């Protein structure tokens, strides 16, 4: 059916979402970056350490109710 979750950023800020399952999480990812104003190529949406790609759904991922999606930014290095 549907489940709620929180997308906690590195600054501890929460953005609540509900989603169906077997639907791509691409839209949830797009909505989060539309708010932070930053490009999505800047942000990585990882759940329990697993990279969420646009084809991933909460069904194939372990995600249950009240779960949390950690948000990390791009790492460059030289």
């Amino acid at each position: 059916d549907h489940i709620n979750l929180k997308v906690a950023g590195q600054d501890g800020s929460v953005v609540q979402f509900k989603i169906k399952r077997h639907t791509p999480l691409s839209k949830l990812m797009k909505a989060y970056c539309e708010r932070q104003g930053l490009s999505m190529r800047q942000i990585r949406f990882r759940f329990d350490g697993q990279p969420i790609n646009e084809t991933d759904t909460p069904a194939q991922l372990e995600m249950e109710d009240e779960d949390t999606i950690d948000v990390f930014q791009q790492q460059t290095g030289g």
Partner: protein
């Protein structure tokens, strides 16, 4: 170690030249490499996390072959999260992976503006730190050893056994950076030879060839 680069140079130049960014090229392991990502391998640009994690997963894919050690590679966000937030923040990143069933654990380490590699070798019972800039970070391996102790418990309920578990760093025993941007290249090329159980043979003079070779290797998802 050798290998030529054939008509690949045309293919490498094809994606190096400008196109719309964010256009995905090469998809495997549920990961994408945009045109912006591959641009970090051009010239002397700083490698990003998408290129490194994609390469580590390719080494992970090669580890399943006979005659090679089995490898599990953490993503580049693991060590930073574990050191700053503790084990319980990363305790659930390995709920589908038994880290004690593999031979080698690859831990790519991001240091703000610098890349480095820590390796756990259950065969040698070693936790080695590799820095192409010569830096010593024995605290990083002490962090990883404490992680293994808290990971054998919570996942297997066994006190991890710590004999001969050598925690050390490399000095002038591995090739050094010699510039200020080839760091991610050294980190990935270190792991390539380590996962092949081959001595580290390259120098800084091989990095321009390595950058273009990795472009083709990532596009075709085939390690050479």
């Amino acid at each position: 170690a050798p290998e030529i680069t054939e008509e690949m140079e045309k293919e490498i130049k094809n994606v190096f030249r400008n196109g719309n960014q964010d256009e995905v090229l090469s998809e495997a392991f549920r990961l994408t490499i945009t045109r912006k990502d591959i641009q970090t391998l051009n010239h002397l640009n700083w490698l990003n996390d998408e290129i490194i994690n994609f390469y580590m997963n390719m080494l992970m894919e090669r580890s399943k072959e006979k005659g090679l050690p089995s490898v599990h590679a953490f993503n580049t966000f693991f060590f930073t999260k574990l050191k700053t937030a503790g084990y319980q923040a990363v305790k659930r990143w390995t709920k589908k992976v038994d880290v004690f069933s593999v031979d080698i654990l690859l831990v790519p380490i991001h240091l703000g503006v610098h890349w480095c590699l820590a390796v756990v070798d259950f065969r040698k019972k070693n936790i080695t730190y590799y820095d192409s800039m010569g830096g010593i970070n024995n605290e990083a391996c002490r962090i990883l050893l404490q992680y293994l102790k808290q990971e054998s418990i919570d996942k297997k309920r066994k006190e991890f056994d710590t004999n001969g578990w050598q925690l050390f760093s490399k000095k002038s025993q591995i090739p050094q950076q010699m510039n200020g941007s080839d760091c991610g290249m050294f980190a990935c090329k270190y792991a390539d030879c380590i996962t092949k159980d081959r001595p580290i043979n390259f120098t800084q003079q091989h990095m321009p060839y390595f950058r273009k070779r990795m472009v083709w290797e990532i596009l075709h998802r085939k390690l050479l």
